[PDB]
Design a protein around this ligand. Structure first.
Ligand SMILES: *[C@@H]1O[C@H](CO)[C@@H](O[C@@H]2O[C@H](CO)[C@@H](O[C@H]3O[C@H](CO[C@H]4O[C@H](CO[C@H]5O[C@H](CO)[C@@H](O)[C@H](O)[C@@H]5O)[C@@H](O)[C@H](O)[C@@H]4O)[C@@H](O)[C@H](O)[C@@H]3O)[C@H](O)[C@H]2NC(C)=O)[C@H](O)[C@H]1NC(C)=O
Ligand SMILES: *[C@@H]1O[C@H](CO)[C@@H](O[C@@H]2O[C@H](CO)[C@@H](O[C@H]3O[C@H](CO[C@H]4O[C@H](CO[C@H]5O[C@H](CO)[C@@H](O)[C@H](O)[C@@H]5O)[C@@H](O)[C@H](O)[C@@H]4O)[C@@H](O)[C@H](O)[C@@H]3O)[C@H](O)[C@H]2NC(C)=O)[C@H](O)[C@H]1NC(C)=O
Ligand code: HEM
Ligand code: HEM
Ligand SMILES: *[C@@H]1O[C@H](CO)[C@@H](O[C@@H]2O[C@H](CO)[C@@H](O)[C@H](O)[C@H]2NC(C)=O)[C@H](O)[C@H]1NC(C)=O
Ligand SMILES: *[C@@H]1O[C@H](CO)[C@@H](O[C@@H]2O[C@H](CO)[C@@H](O)[C@H](O)[C@H]2NC(C)=O)[C@H](O)[C@H]1NC(C)=O
Ligand SMILES: *[C@@H]1O[C@H](CO)[C@@H](O[C@@H]2O[C@H](CO)[C@@H](O)[C@H](O)[C@H]2NC(C)=O)[C@H](O)[C@H]1NC(C)=O
Ligand SMILES: *[C@@H]1O[C@H](CO)[C@@H](O[C@@H]2O[C@H](CO)[C@@H](O)[C@H](O)[C@H]2NC(C)=O)[C@H](O)[C@H]1NC(C)=O
Ligand code: BOG
Ligand code: BOG
Ligand code: BOG
Ligand code: P6A
Ligand code: P6A
Lengths: 553, 553
């Protein structure tokens, strides 16, 4: 008997449950709808859907009318809108978490065992004909044919929106503090148990690396000093597990907290500037707190860096991504009037969503010369050859690649985008239109409606067979971008809920932690409120390069 | 220079922070008060303190006027009051957690590392003359002299309130799912990382014991069958670490999930009745869900037992403790309108508070005969010699001891109460009057005001020297009880916030989990809503004994 839950009968977050041998029931409890499929609207939900503008229309409002938004930003509405953004987005995500790679249902284990990635939509039941439910081919398209013919960069397409490499590296570094899929345990499992902005990519997955990384005097961290400049220490002085090539000297590695940050120079760059920041904050704390032991200087400085990070990510990072005239604002007090769970756990769909490799260029330009991937990847010397200044300046000037549209992944990195597709299939994610539905959107009715063109659309229909079978990652990357934006709507309406729920679910944003005492008094609390990217690189530097998430357009 | 934070300058939850070499500042952020010590009231907080009745007065209201409360219970106010009780109590406890044995300040480590017990009030700074701050002797009273002369049961004082042993055993069994102090890591550390009603005392601290305890067919658990009755299996069939005496046969142990439950027969008795419940729930689920695999039957049955547990604990357990005419009610929807963090982490003061050993009698009466402690402790055969029925009947008939007043711990168990005092001193808890203050009450001004008499009061002043130095556990147990109640006010106003915050902070109470789908449809959801103690023992039994948290008065 065909498993009824593969027709996806339950609409609007209704929970499909199996009864008897061939029956099903939708749990519509607080879905706001009624009926056997959760399709009969309650009076208020009806009133809201009949008044609810198009997502692309609200994107239009936020991206037009500089005069109106000058007024909004200069008044209190700038706050109310922000509070609305935070609230309406974060509500789409379950809190506490619901599902994981092993359980398509609420369970105490999925709640307890934090080494799972969580899950927004359940799995595709294995007892169903199609691998995507019931629509599509009985075996769906090849992974590297999709990746090669639809994601492979033929010519470089720069970000229409100004995004630079100083941004993309920030996205990688920042992101790998909570995306640590362990090949040892398999797909849908994490080594980063913080599940948020804990700076586990600076301080480590465990207390071991942390102890082997900090200097234990004045709360600082261990550090080399090369050419008169401050850098991370080597495995000789701070011996911790870190992936490197098998031949480089030991005085040439560095110790950071994220095992992979030795590979790319941008990652180790951020490790450097953050570490300098931490030790500087330690200095500022000990200036006012001569009596504190080491570990309080450490923990307080860590909280200050967590605050600075969420601050910069919201007001500059997501600002650059959004293109909104509305100036986003990091004020945790905006949520003190709301029902909000200060708690995050990361979903499968959110790192698969976040694979933004098209941001990487054809080459890496530093100054007048040019480094290919083979020269840039794994390069041990470039980070210290050029001052941190010079690398920030060169990265913040070179454009980054557009993420949407398709055919904009360099051929070197392209293999990641293949594995993700295959990984999607092992994680058994639902069809693109089903996530599309769960994040408040309407499913596409044709491939040509998806891509906004006719060639890739025709071929996509030739491969998948039905739009309802398109896959999560592919369709998310082949969607048409908004006009002059860095990617289309699905990445907006899906990624934004995860990003904001993860940035403000941090307990430092709670009413309990969000006090000046938590950050060693007023100097550190204002140090979190006034943090900027320019302050972060420049305050830890001998000179100011061009530092920005956008090129000098 | 004397550490200023030992004067406890900060009032009303203000955070004492040290500046310079000899300065301090109180963080009064949302304490509702102003000023350098947090003593200047804001207008609304002033209006509330001038209208706030005495805690003992509200205790008077809740414990008098059966007619008025017949009306209140029969109407909707029965709900509003409950929502008030839940809200006002739970607000006293920090969420997310704040402190631990190692950090007297908010830190990412205290947030992350769940093997710590949390902490409501900070430690006593070590750089201070008195071990309790600044008031009292430079070395404070002996532990076993206090315990022997002030806590030792001279004659049995029965609970004025009807409490029986079927209750006290329930309190022990129920409590040891979240109190698992590990002697290996030291004081202020736990093995029960659930920190709540996860039934880790039925299913285990880890997935290992869990797998070695369930039968993996139809989601049930392993089980022996002795005399035609269902019991837990032995270490031969379910081999898991469990403390026992070093000589008893292997076919005489049993496997439960709490390592210590083999020792007392009441503990293993609850282990039995719960296990029978679980397997019965598995049967009920598979009756409607022929298609579910083993592990979904397991996880769903576990959630159902968690719901049954919180239900019984709130509406029967805490009811028996309270003596309130107001019928308490477990409805998680009462908090769906509130700002409430569905998240709990256990504090030091809450297991030290919960050491209720005076509930244990001089002897253990079963039927016409009587077993001394030496006969009852560690007894392997008594649980199976008498039917579970007969043990429930004998325990629910024998009175339990009053907890307050003092001089009511049996000499056998008395040593625990000594260690707790010493353990208090290693955990460096603050003075009794300081917790007294933080839970909304006024510090006692004299020992005779504490005990309500003159003899123990005079000697307590002779030992401690000042009431502001009296200790948490001792003063909590020497306090005068309310008239005809099981203990005084401090146990009420302190323990109630921890108990309710822990009972409703469970994620099954969240809006996300609290659905009929989470509990395998409607039969299990109503099985949680209609759970009672009588249903729990009787539905898993051949006959109904007298089962109640109170004697047949
Ligand atoms: C979060 O979840 C993950 C995944 O659930 C956890 O990591 C996994 O943990 C699993 C269990 O700890 C582990 O799965 C095991 O799978 C089998 C289990 O079979 C056992 O039992 C049978 C029979 O019973 C045996 O018991 C006795 C006891 O001593 C044995 O000697 C005797 O031989 C008897 O038969 C046997 O088939 C088997 O021999 C096992 O004992 C094991 O064989 C596996 O090796 C494995 O241990 C799984 O591998 C873990 N990893 C993954 C990726 O799933 C993770 O721990 C958890 N995190 C937290 C914090 O809870
Ligand atoms: C929750 O918190 C608890 C407590 O914080 C965690 O359990 C504790 O973990 C502690 C650290 O993991 C542990 O303390 C350790 O302390 C001594 C001394 O530590 C040394 O630290 C550095 C390390 O120097 C080492 O360098 C080389 C490099 O590889 C080592 O081999 C070599 O052995 C050398 O020591 C020294 O500079 C310093 O001087 C100290 O000597 C360790 O030696 C102990 O073995 C211990 O591991 C503590 O014992 C743990 N237990 C308790 C009760 O505190 C718990 O893990 C945590 N939970 C989570 C989930 O994070
Ligand atoms: C130099 C450019 C980059 C290279 C070479 C690169 C390479 C890789 C590779 C090889 C993997 C496979 C991971 C694994 O198997 O565990 C991977 C994973 C990943 N990359 Fe990249 N990447 C690059 C840039 C980026 C950027 C710019 C982002 C996003 C902002 C990104 C996000 C990720 C994520 C999210 C993962 C998977 C996370 C996990 O489970 O750990 N990468 N990357
Ligand atoms: C025969 C009756 C009882 C005996 C022998 C008994 C014995 C003990 C002993 C020996 C400890 C030692 C603690 C340790 O070192 O880790 C202990 C702990 C404890 N007992 Fe009792 N107890 C009894 C009844 C009760 C009851 C009725 C309660 C109800 C509150 C209770 C609550 C506790 C608590 C909370 C702990 C500490 C928890 C921990 O850290 O694991 N006990 N008990
Ligand atoms: C709930 O969803 C199911 C699945 O989409 C709907 O069931 C199908 O209805 C059509 C039209 O009558 C039938 O031909 C199919 O055989 C049904 N499939 C199954 C699996 O039952 C159902 O109609 C929806 N509920 C309502 C009220 O429309
Ligand atoms: C790593 O980067 C360094 C640059 O910092 C490379 O060495 C430079 O190479 C360019 C041309 O490739 C020269 O023009 C520079 O003069 C070199 N500078 C130094 C200090 O060596 C190095 O070759 C790179 N590593 C790899 C493997 O290509
Ligand atoms: C805040 O708390 C401190 C400590 O209780 C108070 O300080 C004491 O005040 C008395 C009277 O002025 C002095 O004799 C003591 O020497 C003070 N002790 C210390 C450590 O300063 C302080 O007065 C309180 N603040 C206010 C406004 O009363
Ligand atoms: C454990 O309890 C059993 C009771 O079931 C004890 O054995 C009983 O003891 C009483 C009097 O002590 C007798 O009247 C019963 O006839 C005995 N029954 C059985 C089956 O032995 C046993 O002695 C207890 N253990 C200890 C150490 O005292
Ligand atoms: C001019 C009005 C600005 C309001 C800012 C709200 C930001 C969130 O607008 C988004 O719209 C989407 C449309 O599909 C919804 O799916 C999301 O739930 C909602 O967060
Ligand atoms: C007339 C019945 C009133 C029902 C409401 C009682 C619940 C509120 O309980 C209150 O909790 C506070 C914080 O823990 C304490 O300070 C108060 O003493 C206590 O009354
Ligand atoms: C609105 C109805 C009010 C009825 C008057 C109730 C008087 C309660 O009197 C109470 O007596 C207690 C001792 O029993 C004391 O502990 C309390 O301080 C006191 O308020
Ligand atoms: C792009 C972009 O542009 N605006 C964005 C946004 C944030 C909040 C709301 Cl509401 O919208 C995002 C985004 C940010 C993070 C992840 C994924 C998308
Ligand atoms: C005893 C007793 O009596 N009433 C109680 C009560 C419940 C809610 C409010 Cl408010 O009061 C309690 C209690 C409840 C939990 C823990 C410790 C004590």
């Amino acid at each position: 008997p065909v498993n009824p839950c593969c027709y996806y009968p339950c609409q609007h977050q209704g929970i499909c449950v199996r009864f008897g041998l061939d029956r099903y029931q939708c749990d519509c409890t607080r879905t706001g709808y009624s009926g056997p499929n959760c399709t009969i609207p309650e009076i208020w939900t009806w009133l809201r859907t009949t008044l609810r503008p198009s997502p692309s229309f609200i994107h239009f409002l936020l991206t037009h009318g500089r005069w109106l938004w000058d007024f909004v930003n200069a008044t209190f509405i700038r706050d109310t809108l922000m509070r609305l953004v935070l609230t309406v987005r974060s509500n789409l995500i379950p809190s506490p978490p619901t599902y994981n790679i092993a359980h398509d249902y609420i369970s105490w284990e999925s709640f307890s065992n934090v080494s799972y990635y969580t899950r927004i939509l359940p799995s595709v039941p294995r007892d169903c004909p199609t691998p995507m439910d019931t629509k599509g081919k009985k075996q769906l398209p090849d992974a590297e044919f999709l990746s090669r013919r639809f994601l492979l960069r033929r010519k470089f397409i720069p970000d229409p929106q100004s995004t630079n490499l100083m941004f993309a590296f920030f996205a990688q570094h920042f992101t790998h503090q909570f995306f640590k899929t362990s090949g040892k345990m398999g797909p849908g499992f994490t080594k980063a148990l913080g599940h948020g902005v804990d700076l586990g990519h600076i301080y480590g997955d465990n207390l071991e690396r942390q102890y082997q990384l900090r200097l234990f005097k004045d709360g600082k961290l261990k550090y080399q000093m090369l050419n008169g400049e401050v850098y991370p220490p080597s495995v000789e002085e701070a011996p911790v597990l870190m992936h490197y090539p098998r031949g480089i000297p030991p005085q040439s590695q560095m110790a950071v907290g994220q095992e992979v940050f030795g590979l790319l120079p941008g990652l180790m760059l951020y490790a450097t500037i953050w570490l300098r920041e931490h030790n500087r904050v330690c200095d500022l704390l000990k200036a006012e707190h001569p009596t504190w032991g080491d570990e309080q200087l450490f923990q307080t400085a860590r909280l200050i860096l967590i605050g600075e990070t969420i601050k910069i990510v919201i007001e500059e990072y997501v600002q650059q991504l959004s293109g909104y005239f509305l100036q986003l604002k990091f004020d945790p007090e905006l949520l003190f009037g709301a029902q909000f769970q200060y708690r995050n756990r990361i979903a499968m769909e959110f790192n698969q969503l976040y694979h933004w490799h098209p941001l990487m260029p054809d080459s890496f330009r530093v100054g007048p010369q040019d480094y290919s991937y083979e020269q840039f990847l794994f390069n041990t010397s470039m980070l210290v050859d050029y001052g941190v200044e010079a690398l920030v300046d060169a990265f913040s000037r070179q454009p980054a690649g557009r993420i949407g549209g398709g055919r904009n992944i360099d051929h070197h990195i392209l293999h990641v985008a293949v594995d993700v597709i295959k990984e999607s299939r092992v994680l058994r994610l639902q069809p693109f239109n089903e996530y599309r539905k769960r994040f408040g959107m309407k499913p596409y009715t044709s491939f040509q409606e998806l891509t906004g063109e006719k060639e890739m659309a025709a071929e996509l229909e030739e491969l998948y067979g039905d739009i309802d079978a398109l896959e999560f990652y592919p369709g998310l990357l082949l969607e048409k971008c908004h006009p002059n934006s860095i990617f289309g709507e699905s990445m907006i309406e899906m990624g934004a809920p995860f990003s904001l729920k993860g940035l403000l679910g941090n307990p430092i944003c709670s009413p309990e932690y969000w006090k000046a005492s938590t950050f060693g008094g007023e100097v550190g609390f204002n140090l979190v409120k006034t943090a900027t990217l320019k302050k972060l690189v420049c305050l830890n530097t001998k000179t100011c390069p061009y530092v920005s998430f956008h090129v000098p357009d």
